[PDB]
Structures are given as C-alpha cells and as structure tokens.
C-alpha cells in the first residue's frame, strides 16, 4: 500500500 | 532551537540547489531538535553525504538512513530510537517532513518529504516541519523515483545545516 517504514517495507 | 534547516541536493552529482525547511518546534520540539542537529552534524554524524534511498512518485521522498543507506539504518541524537512525540500535526499538504518508523516509538533518523496529502499516515508518523523553499527540487527528485521506490540516479545531500 502507501507506507513509510524503516526496514519491513509493507504493501 | 529555531533556525531553519537547509539541504543542498545533487542528482548524479549535478547540483540542483537548496531545499529549506521550517520545523515545527512549538509542536514537536524533541523531534525537530533531532532533525536540526542531524542536519548540522554537531554530534559528529548526520545527514551530510547521505542519500534518498526510496522515492515514490505521487507519494514521498524517503531519506535519512546515514548508516546503511537502504532503509535498515539510521540513529537519532537520543540513541538508536526515540518515542513518538505526538501526532498533532496531520499530513495535509505536499512538502511536509514526517518521521519514517518501524512501528510505535521507533523514530531514528529516517524521514520523508510528502509530495501529496498522506492522511492515511496521520496518528502513526510524526509530522515535524515543512518545505519553505525548493519544492521544485523535491519534484525533480520525485521524477527520478519509481513505484518500487528505486531511483534511477543518485540523490545526495551534499551539504546541510542551519541557515
């Protein structure tokens, strides 16, 4: 999806 | 505790000019202090010579991983992570600075600059400033990104600090 995560990148 | 922050940006080593940010110290003083002092490099490390490693058109520019340059690193002036200070400012417009994280209370040094409103991130990512000059440079960098976030040119912060 649209996320801004630091290492586990999600859909 | 109040000066605006600048990044000089190059794209494949071509200087593109300066982005200037106003930080929201009155809303998030701990978060703003972290970004400002990583930009000045006063603790001996920070954003100078780092890259934007994940750029997604119509969404945001992600950078600030000055230890691993790929999303797996970064550290704050308070240590490897610090708490979400609050979520009072929302992702209402292009050009906002907000903290990237790996779940609750995992802020370090990675941040993003929005190119659209990103309201679905409200309450999960701390918003802490805004672009006041150089949104054109933000849009130029944005065009070097892709849906996966991979860039087709190196986007570098060649100098940074306070104005």
């Amino acid at each position: 999806x649209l996320l801004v995560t630091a290492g586990l990148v999600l859909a | 505790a109040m000066a605006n922050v600048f990044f000089n940006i190059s794209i494949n080593d071509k200087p593109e000019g300066r982005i200037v940010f106003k930080l929201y110290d009155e809303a998030v003083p701990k978060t703003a202090k972290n970004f400002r002092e990583l930009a000045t490099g006063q603790h001996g490390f920070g954003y100078k010579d780092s890259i934007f490693h994940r750029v997604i058109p119509q969404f945001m520019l992600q950078g600030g991983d000055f230890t691993r340059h790929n999303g797996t690193g970064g550290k704050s002036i308070y240590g490897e992570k610090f708490a979400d200070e609050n979520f009072q400012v929302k992702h209402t417009k292009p050009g906002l600075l907000s903290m990237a994280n790996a779940g609750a209370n995992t802020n370090g040094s990675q941040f993003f600059i929005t190119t659209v409103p990103t309201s679905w991130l409200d309450g999960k990512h701390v918003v802490f400033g805004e672009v006041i000059e150089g949104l054109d440079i933000v849009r130029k960098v944005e065009g070097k990104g892709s849906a996966s976030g991979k860039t087709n040119a190196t986007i570098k912060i060649t100098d940074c600090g306070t104005v």
Side-chain angles (χ1 to χ4, degrees):
Chain A
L2 317 48
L3 301 290
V4 202
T5 87
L8 196 76
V9 180
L10 310 166
Chain B
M2 57 185 139
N4 297 335
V5 165
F6 76 96
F7 289 172
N8 291 348
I9 298 298
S10 288
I11 299 175
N12 279 346
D13 297 309
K14 176 172 164 153
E16 298 295 350
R18 180 186 80 162
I19 300 172
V20 181
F21 309 96
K22 176 71 176 174
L23 307 190
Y24 303 146
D25 296 87
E26 292 177 350
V28 279
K30 190 166 182 158
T31 305
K33 179 185 175 61
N34 178 60
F35 182 85
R36 183 172 286 106
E37 301 187 358
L38 296 171
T40 65
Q42 57 201 75
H43 295 97
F45 54 80
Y47 297 136
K48 183 167 182 188
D49 300 310
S50 64
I51 67 165
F52 281 85
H53 68 272
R54 176 172 175 265
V55 172
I56 301 177
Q58 288 66 66
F59 178 26
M60 60 82 232
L61 283 59
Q62 179 175 358
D65 180 355
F66 61 81
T67 68
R68 300 288 181 263
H69 59 84
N70 67 2
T72 64
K75 64 181 170 184
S76 82
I77 69 171
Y78 311 119
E80 55 185 356
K81 54 201 163 86
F82 69 108
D84 292 316
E85 179 165 23
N86 57 68
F87 299 106
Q88 61 181 324
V89 182
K90 312 304 179 183
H91 297 78
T92 59
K93 66 177 172 183
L96 292 177
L97 281 165
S98 183
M99 287 305 286
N101 65 46
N105 307 134
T106 55
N107 300 288
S109 57
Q110 288 183 58
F111 61 91
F112 60 109
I113 299 164
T114 61
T115 62
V116 299
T118 64
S119 69
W120 57 93
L121 305 178
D122 292 351
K124 291 281 168 73
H125 290 85
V126 177
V127 179
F128 65 93
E130 65 186 59
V131 174
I132 65 166
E133 305 184 17
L135 196 62
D136 61 340
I137 301 168
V138 171
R139 291 186 295 266
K140 184 171 196 70
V141 169
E142 179 184 25
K144 311 305 281 185
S146 69
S148 71
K150 181 178 170 170
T151 60
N152 70 348
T154 304
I155 316 293
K156 298 180 198 192
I157 301 171
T158 61
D159 195 17
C160 47
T162 50
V163 303

